[PDB]
Design a protein around this ligand. Structure first.
Ligand SMILES: [Zn+2]
Ligand SMILES: [Zn+2]
Lengths: 34, 49, 151, 171, 113, 117, 141, 97
């Protein structure tokens, strides 16, 4: 079911998951690992 | 109300994710003249802490 | 003003827009839109001026001449206005559009950079980015002027 | 189109042969100062106009006999090297400057002399056309003129002038 | 020389187009021979260096969108031979088109602001 | 006025060049690498549009109808098949002399109709 | 006369007209070349633009002659013409356009991509396609 | 992997193409290498995007670009390309429920 007008709270859960999964310097660590 | 696009393919997660690291600590950067935002981005790297 | 710009766009798309002296069809369309939006910004600013109370502290600092101009009051209170880079409206950086959020061949006010909000009401993200684009020109010109005039 | 500011100050400070915008302000004297049409006449006397600016389309043919042309123009009948070049002139660009095909043919023959002759239409005709031939690699000769005459020949104005505006000043 | 003869014969041949000379009922050979003289007495070189006059008069008499010029020859030849625009101002439709073209170009060769 | 393109030598598929026949007074085509003489049927050799009016309508392609970043209007029903939905855009061609004219493509598969108003 | 297309191949100090390059890649016939440069013969507009380039190279037909022509302009033009031809072949094989393969038998891949480049140059010259922007970030790594 | 998936689909190999058959057919570019022709690009684009949303052949970094007016599909797998994440919107609705 869709999420109308609840999206302020839901818009930031995905951002928090993104910054938990990936740090802020991920483009450096991934490049050096590769 | 009268369709502008009606054919969207993607959606911004949050429009404020266009800012960087120093520019995203500014409160209400959309109420500031942009050079002031740039100057804070430059000065936020000089703040003691 | 937005409705007038829309009508001008309709006339241009219908080939009803008459080329003004010297200018071409596309150039006269750009001049028409810029004229309409300049009128909008100036008129809104002027209406803002007359609404300020005698105790308004922007007015005290503008009529004294110490710091600021009536254009700053206009931008803070009424509307910020058109953001230009190299003297033209925001260019089609992408293929025939200024940002991914707009539709191809969209010459409307907000599609090409006209900021319709005031600094008190805040800027929509698209026009926030357009305002940053406009403001980068000042920094670039300052940085080159400093080195070009001393010689 | 004014190049003012620090760049202008630099250009003046260091006398140079190629400022970013060389210009003239030309004041008119008699009826040309009083009437827009008469001023336009002088503007056309000044602005460099080449055969290309009046040309609409250029085509090169091989026309076996003038009396039985391969193109539907009968000026060739009245006029009196089957390798033929035909230029058709735009009436808008011709009457922008009161140019007449008499002048066009005069300048063409003045430039290319006797070896190349032109058969012009009349300025009122439905299509302004010039039938041109060499007078005894003819194909590449006509192509060479197709390039040079269009790009290089002068019909009106003076060289070194790119364009000329007309103005009712405010200052 | 025969140079004058042939070209004024061709002028006469141009005057007769459309039988307009017969509808009006006028003799056009005299008119052609007089038109060539009126041209020569202004372009007074033996070979008629500017015979653009004679050929343009021929063609413009033969111009089917301005048959009224062919009808007129009441403006006499002495005037016809000198006319600017090769007398096609009488066409009054091409003349209007040229007038409007001049109206446009007066505006489209001006400053930006 | 036409537009004369390239023609190829059948014997070696090299480009043909025109040549006047000075005996029978006719135009022929020839090849520099082959003694192949064939007869022309156009009588025109070279053309060049200087004003260069060109039909942008033809270079429109039916595939653009599915572009997601293109404005859509049912206010201009298809002239061919009557389908309401049409995508509209400007010429998109550089060197366009001076124009903002619109071109419409029908949003119906296998109609693929491109038209101008 | 006008509108000649040239090619500034690497390790060749001068430029070289393109059709010499194509006949160096082994495409002798003009049609067998143009079908890599003009995918649609419906366009007299396209053909008449590249046509002067085909006019210029009407004195180079044999492939090894094309290689020698390329070799003569090479940075190391050994007086021995055999090694000039070998140098041109090395250029075209491995130093020219590596991303389209650098084996000896990739001539058709390199020819198709070079034809694509020439075709897009023609499109940009016809004005059918807008010039690329050097500031677009899709053009940056 | 992308080359294998493209070749096992309805492509025409560039080296097996008829030169006249490139006119009415889109050109596929993998990392800039013109590598094949496709008669129906609207199937290839949807198949490639479906694959990317499942993380099976096309990894999430790869980007398939469809140029409509100029028939060209360009797929990039090389490094250094800067990208950012966005929600997907197939109807006038989020896939994020
Ligand atoms: Zn041959
Ligand atoms: Zn339809």
């Amino acid at each position: 079911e869709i999420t109308p007008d609840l999206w302020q709270e839901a818009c930031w859960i995905v951002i928090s998951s993104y910054f938990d999964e990936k740090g802020l310097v991920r483009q450096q660590l991934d490049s050096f690992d590769e | 109300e009268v369709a502008y696009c009606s054919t969207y393919t993607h959606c911004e997660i949050h429009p404020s994710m266009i800012l960087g690291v120093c520019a995203s600590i500014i409160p209400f950067p959309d109420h500031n003249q942009s050079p002031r935002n740039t100057y804070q981005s430059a000065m936020g790297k000089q703040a003691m802490g | 003003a937005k409705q007038d710009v829309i009508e001008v766009i309709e006339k241009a798309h219908n080939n009803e827009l008459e080329p003004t002296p010297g200018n071409t069809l596309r150039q006269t369309f750009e001049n028409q839109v810029n004229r309409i939006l300049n009128d909008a910004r100036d008129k809104t600013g002027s209406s803002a001026q007359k609404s300020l109370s005698e105790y308004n502290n922007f007015k005290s600092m503008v009529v004294s001449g110490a710091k600021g101009s009536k254009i700053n009051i206009s931008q803070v209170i009424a509307v910020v206005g058109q953001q230009n880079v190299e003297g033209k409206r925001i260019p089609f950086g992408f293929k025939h559009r200024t940002l991914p959020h707009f539709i191809k061949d969209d010459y409307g006010p907000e599609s090409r950079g006209f900021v319709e909000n005031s600094y008190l009401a805040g800027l929509t993200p698209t026009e926030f980015f357009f305002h940053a684009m406009g403001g980068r020109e000042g920094l670039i010109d300052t940085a080159v002027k400093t080195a070009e005039t001393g010689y | 189109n004014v190049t003012l500011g620090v760049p202008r100050l630099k250009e003046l400070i260091n006398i140079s042969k190629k400022p970013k915008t060389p210009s003239l302000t030309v004041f008119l004297l008699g009826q040309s100062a009083r009437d827009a049409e008469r001023a336009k006449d002088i503007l056309c006397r000044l602005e460099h106009t080449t055969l290309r600016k009046v040309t609409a389309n250029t085509a090169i043919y091989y026309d076996p006999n003038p009396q039985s042309t391969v193109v539907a123009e009968d000026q060739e009948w009245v006029n009196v090297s089957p390798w033929l070049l035909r230029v058709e002139l735009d009436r808008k660009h011709m009457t922008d400057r009161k140019l007449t095909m008499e002048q066009i043919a005069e300048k063409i023959n003045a430039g290319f002399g006797d070896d190349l002759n032109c058969i012009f239409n009349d300025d009122n005709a439905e299509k302004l056309v010039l039938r041109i031939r060499i007078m005894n690699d003819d194909d590449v000769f006509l192509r060479c003129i197709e390039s040079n005459m269009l790009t290089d020949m002068t019909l009106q104005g003076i060289e070194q002038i790119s364009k000329v505006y007309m103005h009712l000043p405010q200052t | 020389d025969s140079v004058r003869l042939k070209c004024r014969e061709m002028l006469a041949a141009a005057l007769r187009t459309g039988d307009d000379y017969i509808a009006i009922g006028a003799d056009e050979e005299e008119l052609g021979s007089q038109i060539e003289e009126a041209i020569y007495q202004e372009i007074r070189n033996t070979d008629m260096k500017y015979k653009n006059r004679v050929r343009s008069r021929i063609s413009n008499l033969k111009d089917a969108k301005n048959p009224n010029l062919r009808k007129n020859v009441n403006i006499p030849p002495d005037l016809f031979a000198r006319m600017t625009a090769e007398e096609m101002a009488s066409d009054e439709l091409k003349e209007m088109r040229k007038n409007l073209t001049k109206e446009a170009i007066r505006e489209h060769q001006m400053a930006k602001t | 006025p036409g537009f004369v393109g390239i023609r190829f030598c059948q014997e070696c598929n090299n480009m043909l060049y025109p040549k006047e026949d000075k005996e029978n007074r006719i135009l022929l085509y020839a090849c520099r690498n082959c003694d192949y003489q064939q007869e022309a049927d156009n009588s025109c050799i070279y053309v060049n549009k200087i004003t260069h009016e060109v039909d942008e309508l033809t270079q429109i392609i039916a595939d653009v109808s599915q572009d997601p970043t293109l404005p859509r209007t049912e206010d201009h029903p298809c002239q061919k098949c009557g389908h309401k939905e049409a995508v509209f855009f400007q010429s998109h061609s550089a060197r366009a002399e001076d124009a903002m004219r619109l071109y419409y493509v029908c949003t119906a598969p296998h109609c693929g109709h491109r038209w101008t108003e | 006369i006008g509108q000649r297309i040239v090619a500034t191949l690497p390790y060749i100090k001068q430029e070289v007209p393109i059709i010499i390059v194509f006949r160096a890649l082994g495409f002798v016939s003009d049609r067998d070349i143009l079908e890599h440069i003009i995918y649609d013969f419906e366009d007299p507009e396209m053909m008449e633009m590249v046509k002067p380039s085909l006019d210029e190279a009407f004195v180079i037909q044999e492939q090894n002659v094309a290689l020698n022509f390329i070799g003569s302009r090479g940075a190391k033009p050994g007086v021995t013409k055999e090694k000039r031809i070998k140098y041109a072949k090395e250029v075209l094989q491995k130093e020219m356009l590596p991303h389209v393969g650098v084996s000896d038998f990739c001539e058709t891949k390199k020819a198709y991509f070079l034809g694509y480049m020439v075709h897009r140059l023609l499109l940009a010259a016809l004005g059918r396609r807008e010039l690329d922007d050097r500031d677009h970030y899709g053009n940056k790594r | 992997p992308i080359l294998e998936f493209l070749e096992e689909w309805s492509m025409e190999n560039l080296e097996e193409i008829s030169p006249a058959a490139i006119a009415d057919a889109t050109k596929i570019f993998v990392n800039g290498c013109w590598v094949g022709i496709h008669k129906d690009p609207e199937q290839l684009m949807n198949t490639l995007r479906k694959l990317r949303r499942q993380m099976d052949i096309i990894v999430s970094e790869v980007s398939m670009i469809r140029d409509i007016r100029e028939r060209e599909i360009r797929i990039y797998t090389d490094a250094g390309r800067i990208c950012r994440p966005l929600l997907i919107v197939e109807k006038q609705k989020l896939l994020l429920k």
